[PDB]
Enzyme design. Structure first.
Site, PDB file in Angstrom:
ATOM      1  CG  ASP A   1     -43.915 -31.941 -10.786  1.00  0.00           C
ATOM      2  OD1 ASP A   1     -43.221 -31.025 -11.293  1.00  0.00           O
ATOM      3  OD2 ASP A   1     -43.618 -32.375  -9.881  1.00  0.00           O
TER       4      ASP A   1
ATOM      5  CE  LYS B   1     -41.099 -34.431 -11.345  1.00  0.00           C
ATOM      6  NZ  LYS B   1     -39.990 -33.225 -10.085  1.00  0.00           N
TER       7      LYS B   1
ATOM      8  CG  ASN C   1     -43.840 -36.803 -11.066  1.00  0.00           C
ATOM      9  OD1 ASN C   1     -43.383 -37.359  -9.778  1.00  0.00           O
ATOM     10  ND2 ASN C   1     -44.269 -35.880 -10.654  1.00  0.00           N
TER      11      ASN C   1
ATOM     12  CG  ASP D   1     -45.235 -36.180  -6.890  1.00  0.00           C
ATOM     13  OD1 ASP D   1     -46.040 -34.788  -6.637  1.00  0.00           O
ATOM     14  OD2 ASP D   1     -44.866 -36.487  -5.533  1.00  0.00           O
TER      15      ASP D   1
ATOM     16  CB  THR E   1     -39.565 -30.201 -12.551  1.00  0.00           C
ATOM     17  OG1 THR E   1     -40.223 -30.506 -11.839  1.00  0.00           O
ATOM     18  CG2 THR E   1     -38.801 -30.698 -12.418  1.00  0.00           C
TER      19      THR E   1
END
Lengths: 336, 20
Positions: free
Chosen positions: A152, A154, A157, A170, A187
Site C-alpha cells: 500500500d 501511496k 502513507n 501503515d 488503493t
C-alpha cells in the site's frame, strides 16, 4: 548492502519468531487529537503520561475489523511492525488490546503526510521526487529481502519527518510470503495489473507502485486516475501511459521500466533485482549510502512549532474511543 | 490540461484502501 541485509535478517527472524505483546495499557496515555482516519480505524496523537513523550496510536475496532474480513491482515501488521527496523519505517513502540479495540502506539512524525505537501506545492521537481524515491527503492530492498511485500504505497502513507526524510507507516497489508499471494488489496490507483487481473502476484507489485509514486510526485497527478475505481482499473490494465512534457528522458525511461505490464520485463523483477533501479540513468546523482545515512540534505523541511504540534495534519472530527464491559472478538485476536 | 482534469475529478482527496 547484502552484508547489512544478512545481519538484518537475523534480527527480523528473532522478533518474527517471538513477537512482543501487550506492552502498555491505555491508562498511561492522553488522547490529544485525531491525525488521520482510515478504512478499519483511526490514528491519534497521544501523550505518554509517565514519560511526557508524544506518540501516534492506531486504534482498530475488533468487530469492524472482523466485519471487513481484516482479521488476518491486522496480525500480519502487528507482527511485521514489532519485528522490523530500518531508518525510513516508523517504529512501533507499544501494542496492546482491550475489550473493544486493538492498539498500536508508535513514534509521532510531525511533518505531516507527503500527500498534504504534494497536493499543496502541486508537484515536486525531479531532484526532490528522486530524493524521496531513493528512500523507497532502499526501504523496499530491505522489506523485500525479508520476504515481506508492503502492498500500500501511496502519498497518504509516507510521513515526512523533522529532518525532511520519509517514514513509511501503515503496514496493514504487509504480508510475509516466499512465493505468490492472491488478495485484492491496495488503493485503486496504485494497483499493478496482475492484481486487478487476479493472476497471483508477488514483490513486483511493489515496483509497479513505486513507479506510480514517482509519476504522481513529479507530475502532480497519478498516471491512471478517473472518478470510479472501475474506470481506473480499466486504464491500468491497458497500460498506455502518457508523460508530461517536463519529464526528462531518463525519468520517462525509468517509469517506462517500472510501469511495465509484463512482469518478466519489469524493473526490480529482473535478474539484477533492485540494482537495475539503483543504476538507471536517473539515479546517477544518487549517493545511496548518504541517503541511508540520512546525511543528504533535505529538500523541504517542515516547520514543527515545537512539541506536539499537529499543524502539518488536517483536522478530523473526533469520535470517542470507548471500550465495552464485555470482551469483544476474543479468540480471533488472541495473538495480538 | 491533465492537471486541470485531475482537479475537477473527485479523487483528489485521501484515497481509501480497497479491502476487497
Amino acid at each position: 548492502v547484502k552484508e547489512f541485509l544478512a545481519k538484518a535478517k537475523e534480527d527480523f527472524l528473532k522478533k518474527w519468531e517471538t513477537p512482543s505483546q501487550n506492552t502498555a495499557q491505555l491508562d498511561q496515555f492522553d488522547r490529544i487529537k485525531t491525525l488521520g482516519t482510515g478504512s478499519f480505524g483511526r490514528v491519534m496523537l497521544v501523550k505518554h503520561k509517565e514519560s511526557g513523550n508524544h506518540y501516534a496510536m492506531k486504534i482498530l475496532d475488533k468487530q469492524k475489523v472482523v466485519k471487513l474480513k481484516q482479521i488476518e491482515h491486522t496480525l500480519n501488521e502487528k507482527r511485521i511492525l514489532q519485528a522490523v527496523n530500518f531508518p525510513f519505517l516508523v517504529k512501533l513502540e507499544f501494542s496492546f488490546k482491550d475489550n473493544s479495540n486493538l492498539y498500536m502506539v508508535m513514534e509521532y512524525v510531525a511533518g505531516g503526510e507527503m500527500f498534504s505537501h504534494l497536493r499543496r506545492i502541486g508537484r515536486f521537481s525531479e531532484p526532490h521526487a528522486r530524493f524521496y524515491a531513493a528512500q523507497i527503492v532502499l526501504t523496499f530492498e530491505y522489506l523485500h529481502s525479508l520476504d515481506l511485500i508492503y502492498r500500500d504505497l501511496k502519498p497518504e502513507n509516507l510521513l515526512i519527518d523533522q529532518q525532511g526524510y520519509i517514514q513509511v507507516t501503515d503496514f496493514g497489508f504487509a504480508k510475509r510470503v516466499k512465493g505468490r499471494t492472491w488478495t485484492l488489496c491496495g488503493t485503486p490507483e496504485y494497483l499493478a495489473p496482475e492484481i486487478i487481473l487476479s493472476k497471483g502476484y508477488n514483490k513486483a507489485v511493489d515496483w509497479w507502485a513505486l513507479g506510480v509514486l514517482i509519476y504522481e510526485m513529479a507530475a502532480g497527478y497519478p498516471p491512471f486516475f478517473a472518478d470510479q475505481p472501475i474506470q481506473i482499473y480499466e486504464k491500468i490494465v491497458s497500460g498506455k501511459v502518457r508523460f508530461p512534457s517536463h519529464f526528462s528522458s531518463d525519468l520517462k525511461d525509468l517509469l517506462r521500466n517500472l510501469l511495465q505490464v509484463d512482469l518478466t520485463k519489469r524493473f526490480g523483477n529482473l535478474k539484477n533485482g533492485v540494482n537495475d533501479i539503483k543504476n538507471h540513468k536517473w539515479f546517477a546523482t544518487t549517493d545511496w549510502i548518504a541517503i541511508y545515512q540520512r546525511k543528504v540534505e533535505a529538500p523541504f523541511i517542515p516547520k514543527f512549532k515545537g512539541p506536539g504540534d499537529t499543524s502539518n495534519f488536517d483536522d478530523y472530527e473526533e469520535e470517542e474511543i470507548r471500550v465495552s464491559i464485555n470482551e469483544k472478538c476474543g479468540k480471533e485476536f488472541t495473538e495480538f | 490540461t491533465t492537471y486541470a482534469d485531475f482537479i475537477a475529478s473527485g479523487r483528489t482527496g485521501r484515497r481509501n484502501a480497497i479491502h476487497d
